[PDB]
Design a protein that fits this description.
Chains A, B: It is found in: Cytoplasm. Chains A, B: Belongs to the Cu-Zn superoxide dismutase family. Chains A, B: InterPro entries: SOD-like_Cu/Zn_dom_sf (IPR036423), SOD_Cu/Zn_/chaperone (IPR024134), SOD_Cu/Zn_BS (IPR018152), SOD_Cu_Zn_dom (IPR001424). Chains A, B: It catalyses: 2 superoxide + 2 H(+) = H2O2 + O2. Chains A, B: This is Superoxide dismutase [Cu-Zn]. The structure is a homodimer of 156-residue chains. Chain A is mainly β and 156 residues long. Chain A has a single domain, classed as Immunoglobulin-like. Helices cover 4% and strands 41% of the residues of chain A. Chain A has an 8-stranded antiparallel beta sheet with strand order 6-4-8-9-1-2-3-7, with no helix packed on it. Chain A is globular, with a radius of gyration of 14 Å. In chain A, 51% of the residues are buried. Bound molecules: copper (II) ion (2 copies) and zinc ion (ZN) (2 copies). The site of one zinc ion (ZN) has 6 residues of chain A, from loops.
Amino acid sequence: SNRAVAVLRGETVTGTIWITQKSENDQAVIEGEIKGLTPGLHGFHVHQYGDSTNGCISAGPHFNPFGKTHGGPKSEIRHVGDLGNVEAGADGVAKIKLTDTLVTLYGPNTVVGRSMVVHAGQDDLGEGVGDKAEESKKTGNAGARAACGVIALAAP
Amino acid sequence: SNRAVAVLRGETVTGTIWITQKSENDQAVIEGEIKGLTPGLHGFHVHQYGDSTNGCISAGPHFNPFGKTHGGPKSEIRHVGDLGNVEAGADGVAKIKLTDTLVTLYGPNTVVGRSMVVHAGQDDLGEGVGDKAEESKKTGNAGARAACGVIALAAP
Ligand SMILES: [Cu+2]
Ligand SMILES: [Cu+2]
Ligand SMILES: [Zn+2]
Ligand SMILES: [Zn+2]
């Protein structure tokens, strides 16, 4: 099996996210907690780069090795990195428990060394319309990057 | 080409280290700066894991995919992660400029997702003798881990 962990750092938001995967043929299990969030829904994605020399800016765009448009985790068309929204409760804490069929810790498309990023706003899952449509298909209109962390290899 | 960066964090020591590599057939070029160090020589290695949930402890041992004993960068027998000593000047700053033939950002033995660690003490390069010999061949007797950072993928 493989295991990875991202320690999310930000000015006011922080957290720890674990990814475990039994084998290259199994889904990634993504679990952890993020704190300091405003109550409500917050976009959550794997971005292309783990580079934090420019804070969360240097993370680049959503991880998208297959060249798709932005969607939610259940969408037929989505970026590999599209994990949808996490929900923070009244105390500002989001508990995260997800499985994903595109995110992997094995092979050429591994997310190891890349980043996890949580956003200030809610991800529209690529379903935005009108003047929001163009950006919806890139980023889901989730707004500013509140915290980020590098996906690090961990002992299995 | 490939590029990676490690932002080293610690209680008093910090730094940024870049790794660039033109192709899988080229040597890794390792360059950057570490500050807050005592003047003198400090051990510097790639460790197996990037996991920082337990500070630098969770980095595990020196990265050693080929199952060798510890040495210096010029040794015939060394761990992949063995980068020797860096030298901090009077102001506590070490300027780093190294090339390495074992460290790579390509293929199954990539260091992406692992960690760089700088130590409080000097690495004896595996040449320790007497009661120091056993540990010399594991860690070079470099002592405590002063700072660590995950090796993150960066835009080339
Ligand atoms: Cu994002
Ligand atoms: Cu070390
Ligand atoms: Zn996306
Ligand atoms: Zn070593």
